[PDB]
Amino acid sequence: VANGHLELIFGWLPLIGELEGAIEYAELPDLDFIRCHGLHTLVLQSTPW
Amino acid sequence: VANGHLELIFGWLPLIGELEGAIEYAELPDLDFIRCHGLHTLVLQSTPW
């Protein structure tokens, strides 16, 4: 049983490395930019014709 | 007695012939063969879906 379990652990080892490498892919500081806009008006004067 | 025992042993002689023949028959070198099998396995991995 010991020889069968040690072999399985050894075979597991590389997948753990791949998963760890994938973990580092999540902490990459990358993003974009957000924008907004605002307007307002004020009627001044008016007259008929 | 000297003649009777001689006749008796001469009559016993032939039986020793077939007895030695059977003894030789018991030494005949013969035999058959034996053959077997076997199998060991090991799981690799698994994931959900």
Swiss-Prot record, chains A, B:
Residues shown, of full length: 202 to 250 of 449
UniProt-recorded name of the protein: Maturation protein A
Annotated function: The maturation protein is required for the typical attachment of the phage to the side of the bacterial F-pili. Binds to sequences located toward each end of the genome, hence circularizing it. The RNA genome-maturation protein A complex is released from the capsid upon host receptor binding. Maturation protein A enters the cell along with the viral RNA.
Protein family according to the UniProt entry: Belongs to the Leviviricetes maturation protein family.
Locations listed in the record: Virion
Originating organism: Pseudomonas phage PP7
Subunit record text: Interacts with the host pilus.
